């Protein structure tokens, strides 16, 4: 399937080539920073997914607390 690692790598390579294009430079100007961008994109995508899961868990807990607080009105 489409994992966070591959989409992150594609986004990193794309943003490196996009930065190179915006400066009128060749797309594959410095290959090493293309590799660095792929790695950073993969890392950022994985961290984003890991943070999203925890964020949803925290939101669920906080909504449970809010609903519990609201339910006390009927007593």
């Amino acid at each position: 399937p489409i994992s966070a690692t591959m989409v992150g790598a594609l986004l990193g390579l794309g943003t490196q080539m996009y930065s190179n294009a915006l400066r009128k430079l060749p797309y594959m100007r410095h290959p090493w920073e293309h590799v660095v961008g792929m790695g950073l994109g993969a890392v950022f995508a994985n961290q984003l997914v890991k943070w999203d899961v925890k964020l949803k868990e925290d939101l669920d807990v906080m909504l449970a607390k809010a609903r519990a607080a609201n339910e006390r009105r009927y007593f």
Partner: protein, 487 residues
């Protein structure tokens, strides 16, 4: 296993690959774009093969979360109604790519990229089963079409036409978005299958139906708002007009079929005379205004308004002959009309003019074009043995069963339709030549001969044996005919 994910991802890969290719490699860009379009077309054809025609449930369903609480999400699915629309919108793109084959050196990579993004956006429109995301991809088409109209327009008028089209689409879009928001707040979700099982209070049906009609009637121009279509259509490249008439005019009717005719069965019945009145006068007025036009592309563009307003008579009849026969007309119109604009594009590419006065006697210098042009003239005028007659007649028998008067008024459409269709052909093709105006000629090349071949085959195949298409829809259109009915 062929699913809706790959069919949508293929144009994405096609557009991304050309995005990072040097523009000096003009050949590679054209080859990769054409290959991507053809692969997408074959993918759609394969999706046709494995399509079950016995269940009303949406097939090849795919889900992707959009909101954190799964309130709204990317729900992709096709049924007997939107399958052929997907096939047509994937088939038209390679033809559009092949149209600009010779002059592609000036357009560049931004042409194929724009058309592939267009194909990506139109495939998802016919596949979305979420009301909100259907709006998101509904109005995402403006940017590629705005760019196509403006950057590669013919004259300086391209700024005015693009502004007018964009403004009309926006004014429809936001008035629809307010209704979508009101539906989301009341019901709770925007899933189509959930919105089709929720009872709407009778007072809210009229307001929501009117708000939906505001956006849809613009893209299926009824009467007050068919003034953007001629200008934006004439001020468009040859392939640009194929997209605007082939597919962009099918959003309004598809939107009516998917989100209006079912979500409000009671509101649809109340507004049936209103739609019959607008469509009857539109057929009479537009088929009559067509006679007094002098531009080649402004006459065929007026042949679509009459045909597309004949479709909305069929949909609102609410029977198998009407709704089922209206689908065949749009597939037929998507092929007949888009083929006519290819014929005009052939004439315009050689001789940079569109006035009918300059054209005449082409039967003696361009005989293959005359033979091909005449065939699509017959299809445009609803001749039996063509795909247009099957849809045209099935709509009439679907509306006569509901109202004899509206079927009578719509029957004069083919009286006037056969008037200008042949009268245009007599002017352009038949007659004497005019060496004072134009004297150098060239008949259809290899591309033009090959491009028209799928239109020729796909027009009589649907015209003599429409049972292949019809039997794939009856299970899906019959569940559409009755939703609130239980007897």
């Amino acid at each position: 296993y062929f699913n809706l994910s790959g069919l949508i991802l293929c144009p994405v890969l096609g557009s991304i690959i050309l995005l990072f290719i040097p523009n000096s490699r003009i050949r590679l860009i054209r080859l990769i774009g054409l290959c991507a379009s053809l692969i997408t077309f074959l993918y759609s054809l394969v999706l046709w093969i494995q399509f079950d025609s016995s269940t009303a449930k949406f097939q090849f369903v795919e889900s992707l979360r959009w909101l954190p609480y799964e309130n709204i999400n990317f729900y992709l699915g096709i049924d007997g109604i939107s399958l052929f629309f997907v096939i047509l919108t994937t088939f038209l793109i390679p033809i559009c790519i092949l149209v600009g084959w010779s002059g592609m050196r000036s357009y560049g990579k931004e042409y194929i990229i724009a058309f592939l993004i267009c194909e990506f956006l139109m495939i998802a429109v016919f596949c979305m089963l979420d009301l909100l995301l259907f709006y998101v991809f509904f109005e995402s088409v403006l940017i590629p079409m705005f760019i196509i109209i403006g950057v590669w327009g013919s004259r300086q008028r391209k700024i005015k036409a693009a502004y007018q089209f964009f403004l009309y689409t926006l004014l429809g879009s936001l008035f629809m978005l307010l209704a979508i928001l009101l539906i989301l707040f009341q019901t709770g979700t925007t899933d189509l299958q959930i919105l089709l099982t929720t009872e709407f209070s009778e007072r809210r049906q009229i307001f929501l139906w009117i708000a939906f009609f505001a956006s849809f009637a613009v893209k299926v121009p009824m009467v007050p708002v068919h003034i953007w279509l001629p200008e934006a259509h004439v001020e468009a490249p040859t392939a640009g007009s194929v997209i605007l008439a082939g597919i962009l005019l099918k959003f309004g009717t598809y939107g009516f079929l998917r989100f209006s005719i079912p979500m409000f069965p009671e509101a649809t019945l109340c507004f049936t005379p209103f739609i019959y009145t607008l469509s009857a006068i539109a057929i009479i007025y537009t088929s009559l205004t067509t006679l007094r036009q002098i531009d080649l592309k402004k006459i065929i563009a007026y042949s679509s308004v009459a045909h597309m307003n004949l479709v909305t008579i069929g949909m609102f009849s609410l029977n198998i002959q009407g709704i089922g026969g209206s689908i065949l007309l749009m597939l037929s119109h998507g092929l007949v009309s888009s083929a006519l604009f290819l014929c005009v594009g052939v004439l315009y590419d050689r001789h940079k003019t569109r006035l009918v006065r300059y054209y005449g006697g082409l039967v003696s210098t361009m005989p293959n074009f005359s033979t091909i042009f005449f065939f699509f003239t017959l299809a445009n005028m609803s001749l039996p043995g063509t795909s247009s007659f099957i849809g045209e007649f099935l709509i009439l028998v679907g509306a006569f069963q509901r109202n004899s008067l509206v079927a009578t008024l719509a029957a004069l459409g083919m009286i006037l339709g056969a008037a200008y269709s042949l009268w245009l052909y007599n002017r352009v093709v038949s007659g004497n030549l005019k060496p004072d105006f134009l004297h150098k000629f060239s008949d259809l090349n290899g591309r033009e001969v090959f491009i028209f071949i799928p239109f020729l085959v796909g027009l009589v195949w649907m015209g003599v044996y429409p049972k292949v298409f019809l039997d794939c829809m009856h299970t899906s259109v019959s569940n559409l005919v009755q939703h609130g009915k239980f007897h």
